[PDB]
């Protein structure tokens, strides 16, 4: 009925406290992208790290991985990689962000965004596959740093 | 602080003539191009209103059967000089059975471009482009309020003369033809005017040793514009 | 249902705002301070927590400071608190109050609104879009990044409603109003013009978002006074100071400036350039239609005897202003209460017409 009413924001933050929110998101997300993504994921990401305790934030991150896995503009999923620190995500976002060919620039804030673990796990599973070898070029070292200094 | 109107400058020039050279700049543009086939010439009318009937504004007026002209800025100061220049060319053909050449016309005009004074008033406010075909081939001539008369091969005046002279020196050379120069002029026109270029904005005036008189009625202008 | 929890926690934050030994520390600050707290005057400040002050007789002392109050509230030309026994800086004194401010700042809701102006409708939207809509609605200008128009000159023949327009802007407002008639910039002492100008705009820039309305400024040039020093060679310097104060240095700020003249041709055009003043608005003698609104509104609150026609009065003078209309609409009432009446007949307007116009 609130998908009929179409004003989210308050219905969403009410229906957080009843995963329920998982089937709520994949049930709700068909057409409107930036209201749920920007509005819901902004206010509920910020208020979820702000006021809400940790274990429901994993449901935010996984079902947001679902609907953002449906969606484009991948740094939403890369900030999901910031809070998740998941290794499947970088493989999915490199087959998907190689599927969307800027490029070295998301290499740059990829390497800035990533922690110590996932560029070595990334360079070992991409040492296996690599699909063009340019992600072995970018996403270990030396190509965050080759455009900048000149 | 009102000084005498016939005062030079602390730097040297004058005042009122310099202010006349400033007063040219508000006027409408005009472009004339000398070509050995003949002299072509163009102007903008600057139509303001739709109530303003367009075919009545004169920019190209007729001095002789072979000496053309175009005016700028103030209209009516130019009208006096056009009338008088005609009279003096008629005096020359009368007392000499021959055609007063265009340089002699413009010498006769800039003899009293500055006779401005209180006895025997202000300086005139018009820049003039003079063409025609004398015995020395085609001629294109340009004067000023200060009487400093010079020959110009393709001079552009008035409000858009900076880019007109620059982009004109881009396209011009010595061995141009007529129609190439005509469309080369009106390209510059519809880069320097403000309104859409159409049948009513501009008017041409071309005089040739072959096309003996300057003749330019309407709707060959349509044929020239649709050639763009 | 956020009202309950929001109110409980907000009242807790408000009671913790009042929840900011300790009484022993207050008594110790009172022990450091003397009871006869003497007042001094700063001249300079030395950065080593002791500076120079100046007593009321002229004696001056290098004295330390009881540093808990913000000493950086103080500049040269400030008022401090000092001791008798050691002359030390007890602390800051709040500022003296405030004859220039109380004189030059209109405090009150100052008369009627746009329901009283007689049929302008185009000048009104210009001053609206220059002062009211910028200040009260500062959201459109962010969209285009365009700075608001700075200055507005009202001008026209006398009687057209410059003063009304200023009062109507001062009615519907949200800013501090500052009114100085321009004829108060002519002083019988030398060098008193720039002092008034710098104090005026100091008040404006220090207090608030503001509207400085400077009325009848054209009389500063065309009125020489015997009660003066050397006239034009001081008046010109005063105008030059007003000029530099209006569009000089250092990030002008949130100060609106509206000026009103009768004649405009006797003005030094250096004020009248844009960058200072962007809108110049003509006030003509209106028509024979908005006169009906003027007579209507100036007869809207009276027991008008309906045996009169206002079109008899519109035709009367060919160049009457709202001044003449107010004058007749009040003089007819003065004729009415001369003979203990309430309603106003036609001959009242006739006598009022023959009293206002032709005398």
């Amino acid at each position: 009925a609130e998908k009929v009413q179409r004003e989210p924001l308050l219905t969403l933050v009410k229906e957080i406290v009843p995963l329920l929110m998982e089937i709520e998101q994949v049930d709700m997300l068909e057409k409107d992208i930036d209201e749920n993504a920007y509005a819901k994921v902004c206010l509920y990401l910020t208020s979820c790290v702000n006021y809400v305790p940790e274990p429901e934030n994993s449901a935010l991150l996984r079902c947001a991985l679902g609907v953002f896995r449906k969606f484009s503009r991948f740094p939403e999923a890369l900030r999901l990689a910031l809070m998740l620190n998941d290794m499947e995500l970088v493989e999915d976002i490199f087959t998907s962000c190689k599927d969307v060919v800027m490029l070295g620039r998301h290499g740059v804030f990829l390497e800035l965004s990533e922690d110590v673990e996932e560029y070595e796990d990334l360079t070992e599973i991409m040492s296996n596959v690599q699909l063009n070898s340019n992600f072995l070029a970018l996403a270990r070292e030396l190509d965050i740093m080759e455009p900048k200094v000149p | 602080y009102d000084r005498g109107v016939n005062t030079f400058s602390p730097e040297g020039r004058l005042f009122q003539v310099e202010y006349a050279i400033e007063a040219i700049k508000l006027g409408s543009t005009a472009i004339g191009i000398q070509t050995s086939e003949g002299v072509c010439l163009a102007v903008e009318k600057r139509i303001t209103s739709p109530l303003m009937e367009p075919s009545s504004i004169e920019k190209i007026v007729e001095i002789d059967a072979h000496i053309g002209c175009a005016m700028s800025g103030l209209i009516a100061d130019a009208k006096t000089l056009i009338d008088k220049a005609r009279v003096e060319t008629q005096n020359h053909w009368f007392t000499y059975n021959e055609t007063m050449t265009v340089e002699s016309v413009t010498q006769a005009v800039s003899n009293l471009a500055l006779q401005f004074g209180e006895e025997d008033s202000r300086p005139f406010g018009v820049a003039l482009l003079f063409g025609g075909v004398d015995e020395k081939g085609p001629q294109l001539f340009h004067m000023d309020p200060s009487g400093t008369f010079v020959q110009c091969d393709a001079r552009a005046i008035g409000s858009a003369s900076e880019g007109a002279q620059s982009s004109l020196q881009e396209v011009y050379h010595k061995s141009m033809t007529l129609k190439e120069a005509i469309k080369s002029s009106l390209i510059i026109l519809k880069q320097v005017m403000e309104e859409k270029l159409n049948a009513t904005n501009i008017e041409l005036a071309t005089v040739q040793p072959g096309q003996n008189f300057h003749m330019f009625t309407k709707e060959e202008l349509e044929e020239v514009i649709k050639d763009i | 249902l956020e009202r309950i929890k929001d109110y409980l926690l907000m009242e807790e934050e408000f009671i913790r705002n009042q929840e900011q030994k300790q009484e022993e520390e207050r008594s110790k600050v009172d022990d450091l301070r003397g009871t006869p707290m003497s007042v001094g005057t700063l001249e300079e400040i030395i950065d080593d927590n002791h500076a120079i002050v100046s007593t009321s007789v002229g004696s001056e002392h290098y004295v330390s400071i009881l540093s808990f109050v913000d000493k950086d509230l103080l500049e040269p030309g400030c008022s401090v608190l000092l001791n008798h026994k050691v002359h030390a800086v007890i602390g800051v004194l709040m500022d003296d109050t405030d004859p220039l401010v109380t004189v030059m700042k209109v405090e009150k809701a100052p008369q009627e609104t746009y329901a009283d102006i007689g049929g302008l409708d185009n000048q009104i939207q210009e001053i609206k879009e220059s002062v009211e809509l910028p200040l009260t609605h500062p959201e459109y200008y962010e969209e285009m990044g365009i700075k608001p128009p700075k200055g507005v000159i009202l001008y026209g023949p006398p009687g057209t409603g410059k003063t009304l327009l200023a009062k109507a802007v001062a009615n519907q407002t949200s800013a501090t109003f500052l009114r100085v008639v321009g004829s108060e910039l002519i002083q019988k002492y030398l060098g008193d013009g720039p002092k008034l100008v710098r104090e005026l705009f100091r008040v404006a820039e220090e207090h608030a978002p503001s509207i400085v309305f400077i009325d009848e400024i054209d009389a500063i040039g065309t009125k020489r006074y015997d009660s003066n020093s050397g006239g034009e060679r001081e008046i010109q310097r005063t105008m030059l100071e007003l000029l530099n104060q209006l569009d000089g240095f250092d990030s002008r700020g949130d100060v609106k400036v509206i000026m009103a003249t009768n004649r405009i041709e006797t003005l030094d055009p250096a004020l009248i350039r844009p960058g200072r003043i962007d809108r110049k608005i003509e006030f003509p003698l209106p028509d024979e239609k908005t006169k009906k609104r003027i007579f209507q509104i100036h007869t809207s609150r009276m027991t008008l005897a309906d045996d009169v026609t206002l079109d008899d009065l519109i035709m009367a003078k060919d160049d009457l202003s709202g001044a003449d209309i107010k004058a007749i609409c009040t003089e007819a009432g003065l004729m009415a209460l001369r003979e203990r009446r309430m309603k106003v007949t036609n001959e009242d307007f006739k006598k009022s017409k023959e009293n206002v116009l032709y005398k």
Binding site: - | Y19, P50, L51, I75, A76, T80, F116, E118, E119 | -
Partner: protein, 239 residues
Amino acid sequence: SYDRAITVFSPDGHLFQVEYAQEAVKKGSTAVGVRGRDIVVLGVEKKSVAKLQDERTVRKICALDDNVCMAFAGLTADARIVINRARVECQSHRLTVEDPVTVEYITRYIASLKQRYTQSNGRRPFGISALIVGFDFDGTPRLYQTDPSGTYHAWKANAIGRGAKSVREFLEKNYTDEAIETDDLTIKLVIKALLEVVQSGGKNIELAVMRRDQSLKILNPEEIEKYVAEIEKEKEENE
């Protein structure tokens, strides 16, 4: 005599008195004029009469010939001088060439006089702006206006006097070819334009026409009243 130059150029390229004497035109009475194809019409608004006096002397529309008609704005005395000189000139043209005087000639004369008047030694420029409507040979209606600069300048409808911008804006959204189809409608078009101008009580609406094979007829202000009445009837028929 008076050896001085009154009108000096500006430091930024103007004639002060030519551009500034247009203001005296700008603060005068309004007058419009259109041409239909067979009947010409013009008239002035804002007589601003005292409603109780003579009116045969304040006539702002006169004629120079049996072919040509006047109108003006600005101050009336300079118009009186220019009209006297124009009458002399048109009749002296009739002295020579045996035609009726062409309108283009008399407009060139007025503008030429005005320019050599502004040019000369110490003569104050004429702060008027005339309208010269006539229909010369083979019945061609034409109408020109003047300017204190001295630029005869052919139009199709008028915009001078007080608030001429508003009047030309109404003529702008009223340039219908249909309006110059019915002579009566052209008269009513002048009445509606002047009605979109000042009070237009039907008192200061002084209008005169010429059907190009006759002389000027000044209309009696009862016919203009019925014209305004049928204009108000069509305005009611608009709703």
